[PDB]
Amino acid sequence: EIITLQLGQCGNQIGFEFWKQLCAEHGISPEGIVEEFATEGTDRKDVFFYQADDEHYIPRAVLLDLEPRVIHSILNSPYAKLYNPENIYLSEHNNWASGFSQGEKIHEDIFDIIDREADGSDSLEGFVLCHSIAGGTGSGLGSYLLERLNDRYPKKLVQTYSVFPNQDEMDVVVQPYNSLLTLKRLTQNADCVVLDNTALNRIATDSFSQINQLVSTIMSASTTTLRYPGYMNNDLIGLIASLIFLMTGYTPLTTDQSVASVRKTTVLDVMRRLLQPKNVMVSTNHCYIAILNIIQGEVDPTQVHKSLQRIRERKLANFIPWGPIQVALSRKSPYLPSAHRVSGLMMANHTSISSLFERTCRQYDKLRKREAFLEQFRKEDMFKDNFDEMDTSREIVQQLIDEY
Amino acid sequence: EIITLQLGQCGNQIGFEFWKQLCAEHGISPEGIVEEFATEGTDRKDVFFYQADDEHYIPRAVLLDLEPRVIHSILNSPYAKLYNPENIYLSEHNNWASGFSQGEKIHEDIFDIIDREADGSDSLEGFVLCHSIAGGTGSGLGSYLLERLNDRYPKKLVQTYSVFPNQDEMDVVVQPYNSLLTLKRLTQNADCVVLDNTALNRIATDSFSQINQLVSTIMSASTTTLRYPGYMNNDLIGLIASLIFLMTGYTPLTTDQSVASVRKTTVLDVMRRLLQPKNVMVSTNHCYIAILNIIQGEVDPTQVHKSLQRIRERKLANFIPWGPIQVALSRKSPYLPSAHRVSGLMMANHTSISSLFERTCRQYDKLRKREAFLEQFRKEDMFKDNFDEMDTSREIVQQLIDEY
Amino acid sequence: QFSLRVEILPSYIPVRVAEKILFVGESVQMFEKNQEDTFAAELHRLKQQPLFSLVDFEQVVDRIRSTVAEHLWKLMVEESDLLGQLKIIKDFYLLGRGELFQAFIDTAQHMLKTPPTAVTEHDVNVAFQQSAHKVLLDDDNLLPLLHLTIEYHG
16 A cells, blocks of 8 residues: 655645546546446455445645645546545645645644555555645645655655756756755655656657646556556565666657557567666766566567567666666556557666756856845744854765765 | 533524434424325434424423523424424523523423423433533523532433533623533533634634534434434443543535545544544643444444554544544435545543633633622522622633642 | 264265264255256265365365355344344243233232142133233234243152
8 A cells, every 4th residue: 555645836736646547547537437348357456555445546645835726726626526525735825935834724634644555555565745845835734744764664765756946947946945945855755756847848749637647657657566466566566676766768758649659569679778878867987777577468488588688788887887677577557458569667776866956056156156036935933043054965965975 | 322412602502403414314204294205214213313293393392481582482493393382491481690590580490391201211311411601591501400400300311511601702702601600510410522612613614504513413423323223332421431521623525515525434534533633622841541433334343443553553543641533333324315425523521622712711700800790690599799709610621630 | 853963874984974964964954956966066066086185175065055054044133033033032931021920920910929739730721811911912823822831740
């Protein structure tokens, strides 16, 4: 089992479309009813859903937000009735310090909800977090929740889908501070999926609805095998151990109109495609640390071995000199059309990601020398006296970059 | 069997809606007739009702009041004909002393009615009292009746649903005196359910009709197993022995419009919910003395054992260091819809209740130093000479607080 | 009430079918269409076989067994309602209706702490009868069928 903590407008939407994808996959009706064709289903549902006496299924989700508008719109959707009104929380009434201050203020009810959800699962495995690191809501609230959660639950995993601000595009003027602080908290508490609007929209090209549909696709494909038990990799901890910051790529990212080119898609061509920098959805002979490829559809392990052999000989990849990939196979949901003969998802750890922080650090250093937009931060208690928090966070990020 | 003594406007209403709930549960028509579908009923009716030669059932209730208006309205309700006109009593023509003086004045007819009702039951078990402690009517009249009843019937139980005045809201200006005196009498004569408008309306939020509907729900759920015989806890004395001041909480306190969220409701989640201070309908490492949870609907004792084990390990509760809970199961009435898969009611004794009196004492001490609103009290005979009654009552309450 | 014999039972015949025979018959003697003649043809058929084949002896017994058992279950549940009767045993034997006993214990208490004599047997049957009426259980059925016993003088 698992819980999802989605914050800010970004996280709220991310959750909306993630649950849309899930209910599509598992044959769950918008109202929580189960379709007749899926009555005898074999798919495991406990992982993301828990059924109710009324036979309906409820997501293990909690909605958090500093503002009402987004969730109010969500509850006007056809999927509104599905969620649990008890879990959803809205502030009665764009800065990280303010977000953390509110988090300190509203500890009690949030952790009440989290405890209630936790006690309903026998074998909870970890946590899932969806949020954006730039905006005031996501950054600060995620920081506070991560801190108090790692404190509260020292034996549960914490996984996040953190969305990083666009850089080529000059959105949050105060983004460097929030990003740097959120990164501090991620290193200091997060167990383990980086995301950026820049490269994501780049691949989308070459509305937020479609972008986050792709993101939800990534999340669902990541959790597929856990959802669909097989032989190997039957747990999230198995995933994490096989890799341990990450980046992702998915081959069949094709529009509903781009099915006309039914290209004979082997496993070799897919696994190859997952390697190119173009497909890496995120934007010094930098090299890899780990690679995992989850493959959906018919697959012959002989083909997998041949592809691995050929790629190894062709040396299209580079590895650490000081240490000695993985190809897991799953089964598609029996419901969604198998427009793709075989499909592939890749999650990897690669040193080049360091550059991200070097940019943000460069951004942050490009402001701290002139004290820009610190007036609001001084208002909150945390930065009321000084900003030693900022210095510690910057040095922590520098240490991480040095370690990479 | 049992008798109900309801005083003051509060008690009169409380009784109205309590009997409404009872007749709804047992399939008793508003006029006292029995519905065709309930002809072969198995539910025990003697406990709260006695049938009549005309086949109608009459409650074992007595109406008392210093004023006519409330009961006159009651007798204009569709339920008017149900009650016994003989038992109902109305004064022909807001202070505790006046109430007790009248009680001394109208001893004869009240005890005539009580004796008549008592002699109609073979195995009367105790008494039930519903009243408010602030207003003049309820406080004084209940005091007098409790005194003369404990004197008259030294072998019957005396149970009360005492409503305490709101404190956050500044209603009876002379409330401290009436409350303190009623508490004196309760300690000195009452066998055994505290109630406050503040927290009750708080939970209602988060007219008197709905508040007292909830209160009647609490009373009926408390008396369920007695009404519906089973294996264990087949008597009120069994209830009292298993606990012995109290506070209460009920999980499925859901509006008629809030059934849309049909949440899969185990026994574990319910019994857990009954523990939180939020659900405790009333408003130094204070701890518990006793806990009882009555559960309605399908229940597996294995689930109960598992819930008890897990809660014990999670140590969500605190107990006295000097002494070594209880979970009883009942069956729902076969008539009212089972909108809840399993439901839970909790009655507990907890030391924190002491604070209540500390407030009222603080209130009373905040007046006795300046002799506020004593003019009316001096009028009555009881406080005609002095107010030693007040001093004794205050010291008794102080002794009780020290004992806690 | 019949029995079975082992000291005279054949050798090659297993006891399993012997038990099957003992039940299929007693279920008729106690019990006092087409399911009668057809089996007579089956038994007669075996008399023509020039070799006793146990593997076939059971295929005629078990069908006869399952038919009477199916016919007996039809009566033991549908016609003669067992559920109602079991519901009576759970209530009174296993203290299912405990609310009746707490009153009976409340009344018939002083008359049992004393050692038992020849008169206490009736001194309780009345108190138990006073009890069922005291819980407004009015049913002349199944009321006289319950008779408390007093193991006196041995």
